[PDB]
Amino acid sequence: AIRTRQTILVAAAEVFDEVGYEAATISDVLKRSGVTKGALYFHFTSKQELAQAVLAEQVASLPRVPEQELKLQQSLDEALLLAHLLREGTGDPIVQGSVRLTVDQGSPRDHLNRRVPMQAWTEHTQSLFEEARAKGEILPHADVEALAKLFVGAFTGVQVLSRIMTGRADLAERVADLYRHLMPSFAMPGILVRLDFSPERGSRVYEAAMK
Amino acid sequence: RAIRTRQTILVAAAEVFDEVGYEAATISDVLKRSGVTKGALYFHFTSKQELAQAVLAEQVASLPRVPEQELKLQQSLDEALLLAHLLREGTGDPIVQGSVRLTVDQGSPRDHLNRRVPMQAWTEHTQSLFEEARAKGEILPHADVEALAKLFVGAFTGVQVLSRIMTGRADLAERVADLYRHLMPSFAMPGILVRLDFSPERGSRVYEAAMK
């Protein structure tokens, strides 16, 4: 049961990533997972429940990197880690599939709650910014709620454009560009000098998070 | 008569694609919504694919023109807020909403929708305005204008997505203004940011002029 649920979920995420929710079927998930019909239907009744469980595990399946000196470096590290996990070279399969389900508009008919992962990303980002403000890293009257929405929104679209134009190959640089152009508007100048946008730190954070 | 019929079918297909997406859409749905005969549909379009490609091909031309301005960055801002209005539903443009959904929706690897083409056209259009702004001393003299255009097109797309999910695009004007207000200080020359107008009143004047 324990690894079996995960095996099914990973397979469903890969199927949803390739064809989307509507074109996917339970049969495809069975083939890809390589588990019995019994094991699948023990954990999930339907395609709907599968896709909802993929969405519900989006945030928890991001590896958190150890707490940092600078909260804004933590925010930067997470965004570049997420960019790496979305690159198809080395997939986290849950994240890619979950993101596709979230961004794909779907139908009013389907019962997929796409607010849940976005609300969770927004709230997580807002907390980091609130913690950064208490540690003297942000300008005095920064609208931290509006900033969180901006970052989550902007990241999503940079990731979408990057998928369309390069299959996410340039995503690290697009995300670094985004953060380099947004952070000056609210970060204390003395924090900006200290932030590390390098690919080398991107690697170190990624390698540590995998094991 | 045949020009109106083609357009009526296209508008209907755009609305259907907007509601259920490319994959879930069918020719039958487009027929019901358009209210034309099967003969009239297949005269103009062979398939669902050709319908969706024609929706994408009309994306750019269905953006209303904003007048040339003194401040090129104001022109860029005006366009983005106008696009935000056209994506908010009411009398808001069915071709644009459906085209945007087709562009952003990931689709299948086997479908023959070229989603690069409209994004490349948006990127190139934005890059031109920024190139003109750079020559007029509005933005830094060696600003990476290609990278900036990609950032703006990418960021706008995602702000629009997040806004759809959380509010059905109700807050989109403010989210877009926020984006522009927080991105522009990193590459605008000293005088410039204070001269930009993010007001809803200017948004109106631009929208009303564009409808006529």
Residue numbers in the entry:
A (entry chain B): 8 to 218
B (entry chain A): 7 to 218
What does the paper say about this structure?
We also present structures of AvaR1, in isolation (2.4 Å resolution), in complex with avenolide (2.0 Å resolution), and bound to a synthetic DNA oligonucleotide (3.09 Å resolution) derived from its natural binding site. The overall structure is reminiscent of that of other TetR-family transcriptional repressors, and consists of an obligate homodimer. Each monomer is entirely helical and consists of a DNA-binding domain (DBD; composed of α helices 1–4), and a ligand-binding domain (LBD; consisting of α helices 5–13). The dimer interface is formed via interactions between the two LBDs and is formed mainly through hydrophobic packing interactions.
The structure of AvaR1 was determined to 2.4 Å resolution using crystallographic phases determined from anomalous diffraction data collected from SeMet-labeled protein crystals. Notably, the structure of AvaR1 undergoes conformational shifting upon ligand binding, and a structure-based superposition against the ligand-free structure illustrates that binding of the hormone results in an ~10o shift in the DBD of each monomer. This shift results in an increase in the distance between the two DBD in the dimer upon binding of the ligand, which would preclude DNA binding by the ligand-bound homodimer.
